[PDB]
Amino acid sequence: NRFTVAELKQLVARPDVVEMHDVTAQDPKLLVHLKATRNSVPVPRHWCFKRKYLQGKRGIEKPPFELPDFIKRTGIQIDIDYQKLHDAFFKWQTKPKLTIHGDLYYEGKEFEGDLSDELRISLGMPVGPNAHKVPPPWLIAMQRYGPPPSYPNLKIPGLNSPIPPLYGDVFGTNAAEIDRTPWGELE
Amino acid sequence: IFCRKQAGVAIGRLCEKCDGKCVICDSYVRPCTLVRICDECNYGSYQGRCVICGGPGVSDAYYCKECTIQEKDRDGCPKIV
Amino acid sequence: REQERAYIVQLQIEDLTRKLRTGTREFRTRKKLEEERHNLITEMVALTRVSDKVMIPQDEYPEINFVGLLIGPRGNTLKNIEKECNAKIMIRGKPLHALVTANTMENVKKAVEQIRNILKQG
Amino acid sequence: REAKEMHERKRQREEEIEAQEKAKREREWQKNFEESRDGRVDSWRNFQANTKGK
Amino acid sequence: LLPRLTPILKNRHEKVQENCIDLVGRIADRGAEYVSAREWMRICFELLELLKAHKKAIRRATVNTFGYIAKAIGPHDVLATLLNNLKVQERQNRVCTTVAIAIVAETCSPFTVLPALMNEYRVPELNVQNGVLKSLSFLFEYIGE
Amino acid sequence: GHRVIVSDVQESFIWVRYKRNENQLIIFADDTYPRWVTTASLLDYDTVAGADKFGNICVVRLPPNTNDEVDGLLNGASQKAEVIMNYHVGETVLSLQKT
Amino acid sequence: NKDPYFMKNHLGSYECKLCLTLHNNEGSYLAHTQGKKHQTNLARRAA
Amino acid sequence: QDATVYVGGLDEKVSEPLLWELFLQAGPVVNTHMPKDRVTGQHQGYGFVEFLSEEDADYAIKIMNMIKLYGKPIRVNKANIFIGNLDPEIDEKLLYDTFSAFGVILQTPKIMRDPDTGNSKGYAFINFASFDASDAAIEAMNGQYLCNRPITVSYAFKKD
RNA sequence: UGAAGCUUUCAUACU
Ligand SMILES: CO[C@@]1(C)C[C@@](C)(O)[C@H](O)[C@@H](/C=C\C(C)=C\C[C@H]2O[C@@H](C)[C@H](NC(=O)/C=C\[C@@H](C)OC(C)=O)C[C@@H]2C)O1
Ligand SMILES: [Zn+2]
Numbered sequence: 001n002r003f004t005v006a007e008l009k010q011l012v013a014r015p016d017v018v019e020m021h022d023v024t025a026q027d028p029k030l031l032v033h034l035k036a037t038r039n040s041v042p043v044p045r046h047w048c049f050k051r052k053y054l055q056g057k058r059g060i061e062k063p064p065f066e067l068p069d070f071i072k073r074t075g076i077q078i079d080i081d082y083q084k085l086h087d088a089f090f091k092w093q094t095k096p097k098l099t100i101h102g103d104l105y106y107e108g109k110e111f112e113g114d115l116s117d118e119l120r121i122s123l124g125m126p127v128g129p130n131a132h133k134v135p136p137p138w139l140i141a142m143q144r145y146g147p148p149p150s151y152p153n154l155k156i157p158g159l160n161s162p163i164p165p166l167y168g169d170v171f172g173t174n175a176a177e178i179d180r181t182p183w184g185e186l187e
Numbered sequence: 188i189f190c191r192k193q194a195g196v197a198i199g200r201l202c203e204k205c206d207g208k209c210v211i212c213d214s215y216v217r218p219c220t221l222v223r224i225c226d227e228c229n230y231g232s233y234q235g236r237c238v239i240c241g242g243p244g245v246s247d248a249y250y251c252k253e254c255t256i257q258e259k260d261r262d263g264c265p266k267i268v
Numbered sequence: 269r270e271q272e273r274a275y276i277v278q279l280q281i282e283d284l285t286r287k288l289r290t291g292t293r294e295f296r297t298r299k300k301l302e303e304e305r306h307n308l309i310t311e312m313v314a315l316t317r318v319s320d321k322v323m324i325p326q327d328e329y330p331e332i333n334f335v336g337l338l339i340g341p342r343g344n345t346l347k348n349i350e351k352e353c354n355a356k357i358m359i360r361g362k363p364l365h366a367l368v369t370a371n372t373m374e375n376v377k378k379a380v381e382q383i384r385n386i387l388k389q390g
Numbered sequence: 391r392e393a394k395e396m397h398e399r400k401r402q403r404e405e406e407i408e409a410q411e412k413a414k415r416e417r418e419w420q421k422n423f424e425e426s427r428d429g430r431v432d433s434w435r436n437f438q439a440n441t442k443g444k
Numbered sequence: 445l446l447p448r449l450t451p452i453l454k455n456r457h458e459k460v461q462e463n464c465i466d467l468v469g470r471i472a473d474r475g476a477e478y479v480s481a482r483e484w485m486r487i488c489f490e491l492l493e494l495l496k497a498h499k500k501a502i503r504r505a506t507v508n509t510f511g512y513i514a515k516a517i518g519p520h521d522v523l524a525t526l527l528n529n530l531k532v533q534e535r536q537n538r539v540c541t542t543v544a545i546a547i548v549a550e551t552c553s554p555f556t557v558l559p560a561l562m563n564e565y566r567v568p569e570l571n572v573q574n575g576v577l578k579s580l581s582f583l584f585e586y587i588g589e
Numbered sequence: 590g591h592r593v594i595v596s597d598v599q600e601s602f603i604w605v606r607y608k609r610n611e612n613q614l615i616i617f618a619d620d621t622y623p624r625w626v627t628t629a630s631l632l633d634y635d636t637v638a639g640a641d642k643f644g645n646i647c648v649v650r651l652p653p654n655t656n657d658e659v660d661g662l663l664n665g666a667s668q669k670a671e672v673i674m675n676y677h678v679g680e681t682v683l684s685l686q687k688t
Numbered sequence: 689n690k691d692p693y694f695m696k697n698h699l700g701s702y703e704c705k706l707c708l709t710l711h712n713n714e715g716s717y718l719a720h721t722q723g724k725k726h727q728t729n730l731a732r733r734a735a
Numbered sequence: 736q737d738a739t740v741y742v743g744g745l746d747e748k749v750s751e752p753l754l755w756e757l758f759l760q761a762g763p764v765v766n767t768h769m770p771k772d773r774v775t776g777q778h779q780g781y782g783f784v785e786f787l788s789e790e791d792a793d794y795a796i797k798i799m800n801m802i803k804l805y806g807k808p809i810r811v812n813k814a815n816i817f818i819g820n821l822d823p824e825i826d827e828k829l830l831y832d833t834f835s836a837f838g839v840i841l842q843t844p845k846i847m848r849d850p851d852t853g854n855s856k857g858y859a860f861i862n863f864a865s866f867d868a869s870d871a872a873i874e875a876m877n878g879q880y881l882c883n884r885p886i887t888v889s890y891a892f893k894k895d
Numbered sequence: 896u897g898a899a900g901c902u903u904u905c906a907u908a909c910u
């Protein structure tokens with residue numbers, strides 16, 4: 001006198017939220033309906049686990065909790081500057097990577113045309129001149145065979161972009177073919 | 188362990204031992220609202236006695252700021268029985 | 269023959285340990301039984317002491333039992349410091365001092381630092 | 391066992407030298423900290439005077 | 445005066461203790477310049493033990509005087525000493541040290557205490573991180589807004 | 590000009606884009622709160638002021654960068670909107686206007 | 689010791705990654721090495 | 736495997752987001768994979784870039800072939816004489832054409848590949864017709880300047 | 896690749 005998984009999957013508007021034990025509830029139709037509410041994060045997923053919570057693996061070795069960039073810039077490791085500590089803490093304050101309300105944390109969840117200057121220095125490519133032609137070695141194949149079909153809006157100097165463009169390490173630019181000011185903000 | 192019967196006008200008291208720490212969350216920071224106790228807990232020889240250890244009361248009992256924020260001052264007489 | 273020697277030497281160690289425990293006079297009799305046991309162990313196995321003095325401020329703090337804190341229960345705290353530092357520690361005086369003796373100056377310094385840390389905590 | 395004891399003894403001697411250096415270094419650090427003391431107190435007072443001003 | 449006053453701090457009468465602490469606090473608040481520091485550090489380390497006093501008055505005056513001395517001599521040295529003291533002592537003294545750290549961080553803005561306290565969490569030992577966590581707990585409870 | 594804001598009777602706000610060349614209405618953002626919306630007012634290209642049957646006013650602003658170009662994570666839309674203002678007035682608001 | 693399984697965590701407590709085990713001191717780890725679990729885990733890693 | 740391109744010849748300056756940033760101009764590289772070694776714990780010079788379409792992988796293989804990336808011959812591909820330290824941009828037919836100038840080849844040469852990626856391991860084996868071609872390869876080709884990679888030709892088996 | 900639970904005579908640590 002109890003549903004089967006496939007039978008209950010046929011009745012509900014959202015069958016992908018139905019699970020193994022959901023047919024064993026006292027009121028599975030209300031349970032599945034609440035599992036489909038347009039909010040309401042689910043249960044912590046380790047209720048059925050016999051290894052309780054956390055723990056599990058002591059294999060990984062973790063280094064000491066790294067100090068924030070500005071605090072590690074304060075040069076704490078004798079003359080001490082307070083104003084530098086104050087101005088730096090407030091003026092140098094930054095916001096860390098926050099997470100959304102829906103997101104939850106699990107035991108295994110802590111593990112799972114432009115080029116950089118270091119790669120251009122290691123690859124043996126010189127800097128961009130004022131008015132000349134200094135293409136990368138991958139640009140000769142693009143000038144010979146044609147533009148890439150995966151990125152048709154990309155511009156390269158010599159083929160689509162003029163030589164005087166090129167500035168620093170920027171060897172390409174993507175050219176894709178209102179009243180954006182916020183309303184109430186401090187001056 | 189709490190009496191928790193709706194109170195009235197009697198003012199709860201604290202002994203010299205714990206004077207100034209909350210009766211609900213037993214805390215050492217910022218008191219806010221005066222404690223009221225039921226009439227039975229203040230009747231007869233019980234008047235003015237400590238709301239924790241029934242001993243002599245020397246100061247008024249207070250709920251801390253955190254308890255009044257959470258409306259833990261509206262739950263009834265906090266005399267420990 | 270080695271196991272027979274070990275058995276005899278064990279019986280002698282237990283005898284000397286009993287003499288030292290049953291019976292300062294108690295320290296002299298224990299030390300004598302430890303020396304007798306050592307001679308027998310040396311026979312069985314065959315078959316520059318740097319010293320520093322740590323002053324104990326008992327004249328400044330007569331209320332504090334520094335000797336009790338350094339020795340610990342059954343001498344376990346003293347023996348632990350002696351084992352960790354590979355140093356021999358002897359309390360001497362009324363002035364009251366700990367004589368630290370080891371094979372290396374480094375072992376003496378480590379033992380002196382541990383003794384000074386216990387004295388400071390006292 | 392004797393060879394292991396000899397290597398252990400060499401390691402122990404190195405550890406003892408490191409411990410003696412740590413014992414000194416701490417006293418040197420205290421001396422630098424105390425000689426640097428009046429200047430640090432003056433700097434804190436100057437910072438307090440500047441924050442009050444602004 | 446003050447060197448004549450510092451031995452009275454060890455008296456065991458409540459009125460004497462409260463008045464002595466209040467006087468030393470006033471002196472540290474206004475006449476901080478005359479006393480060479482070091483004595484202020486000794487006086488604050490001695491006041492550390494009065495935070496466990498079983499009379500609210502004594503605790504209130506001790507909190508006030510510690511705030512004044514910290515405002516006077518600066519957060520850096522007292523914070524270093526308080527961290528060292530938090531590392532090596534028994535339970536009640538460590539709790540009082542936590543209260544003292546919170547007081548220092550409230551009088552001198554927590555921007556002066558937080559980096560040195562977070563640098564101590566980088567030490568690799570257990571019961572060391574738990575102490576940092578207990579200190580952070582009481583710090584936030586004590587500073588509130 | 591580009592976007593459409595929809596008020597639900599029990600959900601708060603749905604953001605929609607009209608694809609002029611594809612002839613498509615696509616939902617690209619929604620909210621994380623149930624709101625009994627009585628009226629709504631646009632403050633700028635990213636922010637909306639709303640009112641409620643229960644006497645509340647709220648302001649919701651879209652996060653930076655977003656996409657704009659779209660071709661659920663809470664049984665909803667993939668991107669969410671943030672609530673930057675909440676106020677209880679004590680009476681039911683039926684009109685909101687910037688002027 | 690020199691075995692890669694023995695290691696020191698951020699807390700400072702010793703831990704055997706081969707057996708997924710925690711030990712208070714060196715003697716507990718050496719008693720664990722002579723136990724059935726470490727020998728069977730080394731025999732599994734022998735193949 | 737068809738949409739992913741195997742890159743070979745990566746130095747220590749190249750990284751996992753660096754290959755995805757360099758391959759972003761060729762096509763929409765969705766993911767980058769770099770197998771780490773067991774003894775050193777770093778990349779062995781060979782990696783993979785999984786894109787969205789096969790045309791982007793073909794354009795990356797035809798554009799970034801035999802390039803000089805980080806001072807290394809990086810090349811993208813579709814995922815008794817011993818020659819070591821050979822460039823991955825050359826194929827079996829290219830190695831047979833390069834070996835045809837010294838002597839005559841008996842059959843088609845073979846190059847060793849990794850069991851994980853399967854593009855290039857680093858060593859190859861080629862057999863000559865006679866011992867004169869092997870001596871000419873050990874005299875001239877053993878040390879010749881290849882495409883940004885110093886190769887080394889040696890004898891696979893020799894009897895004293 | 897993986898799943899290390901339960902119990903006591905152990906023994907060792909923290910409250
Ligand atoms: C042994 O008796 C008990 C346990 C029971 C009792 C209720 O009968 C007795 O009255 C009571 C009195 C003494 C004690 C130890 C309890 C309360 C006090 O404790 C102290 C140990 C703390 N110390 C602190 O508060 C830290 C900082 C200071 C300066 O405060 C503040 C506000 O910064 C917290 C509390 C102030 O303690
Ligand atoms: Zn009552």
Ligand SMILES: [Zn+2]
Binds near residue numbers: 201203237239241242
């Ligand atoms: Zn009481």
Ligand SMILES: [Zn+2]
Binds near residue numbers: 209212213250251
């Ligand atoms: Zn409370």
Ligand SMILES: [Zn+2]
Binds near residue numbers: 704
């Ligand atoms: Zn193990």
